[PDB]
């Protein structure tokens, strides 16, 4: 009856592990685009549409 609770505690953390791992890789992927494109062109994508 506590193995049921603990399977149900464990998989609800493995879903958190998966989601967290995928943010670690997506931030690493984003950084590579932002350091292979020109920082003036990446600035025009992200910031020149919003600048006072």
């Amino acid at each position: 009856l506590k193995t049921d609770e603990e399977l149900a505690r464990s998989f609800r953390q493995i879903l958190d592990l998966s989601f967290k791992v995928n943010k670690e890789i997506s931030l690493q992927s984003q950084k590579a685009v932002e350091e292979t494109c020109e920082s003036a062109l990446v600035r025009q994508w992200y910031f020149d549409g919003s600048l006072p």
Binding site: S39, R43, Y46, F47
Partner: peptide, 12 residues
């Protein structure tokens, strides 16, 4: 944060 503040003169 530091990469882009240094290009905006303002914290992103």
């Amino acid at each position: 944060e530091r990469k882009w503040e240094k290009i905006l003169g303002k914290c992103p």
